[PDB]
């Protein structure tokens, strides 16, 4: 069960050690692929480590969203959109397969998502869609 923690820690270290926008975008794409693969095997669970992996992923995405340059480039916009899509997919999978998964993390997610609406239209649309799924739906 600790293998998932080791891989997540390694990806976090590789993301943090570099500062290039292209390398960061590539690492975020690899992280998105790994998270999607992990969610593709949610029927049987990750050996009892689903809660910790879910918390680590959502907190990593929240931290990535919180820190960002004031000027958004094309690669930065693509990375932000990929992070938002990954967060939305994670939230949908967790809600669908675990009713009480978000009972301890909904507040921080909403608190992070509220300031995001004051941004470019496309990411505003994604943030509103995620908020509607989390609350209205």
Curated annotation (Swiss-Prot):
PTM comment: Phosphorylated by NUAK1/ARK5. During the late stages of DNA damage response, dephosphorylated following deacetylation by SIRT7, leading to ATM deactivation.
Effect of residue 58 to M: In a renal papillary cancer sample; somatic mutation
Tissue expression remark: Found in pancreas, kidney, skeletal muscle, liver, lung, placenta, brain, heart, spleen, thymus, testis, ovary, small intestine, colon and leukocytes.
Signal peptide: none
Location in the cell: Nucleus; Cytoplasmic vesicle; Cytoplasm, Cytoskeleton, Microtubule organizing center, Centrosome; Peroxisome matrix
Induction notes from the record: By ionizing radiation.
Coiled coil stretches, renumbered: none
Superkingdom as given in the UniProt entry: Eukaryota
Record's function text: Serine/threonine protein kinase which activates checkpoint signaling upon double strand breaks (DSBs), apoptosis and genotoxic stresses such as ionizing ultraviolet A light (UVA), thereby acting as a DNA damage sensor. Recognizes the substrate consensus sequence [ST]-Q. Phosphorylates 'Ser-139' of histone variant H2AX at double strand breaks (DSBs), thereby regulating DNA damage response mechanism.
Family: Belongs to the PI3/PI4-kinase family. ATM subfamily.
Domain notes from UniProt: The FATC domain is required for interaction with KAT5.
Protein name according to UniProt: Serine-protein kinase ATM
Gene name, Swiss-Prot/TrEMBL: ATM
């Amino acid at each position: 069960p600790d293998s998932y923690q080791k891989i997540l820690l390694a990806i976090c270290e590789q993301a943090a050690e570099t500062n290039n926008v292209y390398k960061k975008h590539r690492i975020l794409k690899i992280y998105h692929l790994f998270v999607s693969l992990l969610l593709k095997d949610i029927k049987s669970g990750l050996g009892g480590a689903w809660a910790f992996v879910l918390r680590d992923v959502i907190y990593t995405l929240i931290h990535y969203i919180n820190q960002r340059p004031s000027c958004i480039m094309d690669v930065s916009l693509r990375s932000f959109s990929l992070c938002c899509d990954l967060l939305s997919q994670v939230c949908q999978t967790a809600v669908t397969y675990c009713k009480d998964a978000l009972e301890n993390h909904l507040h921080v997610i909403v608190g992070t998502l509220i300031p995001l609406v004051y941004e470019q239209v496309e990411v505003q649309k994604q943030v509103l869609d995620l908020l509607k799924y989390l609350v209205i739906d």
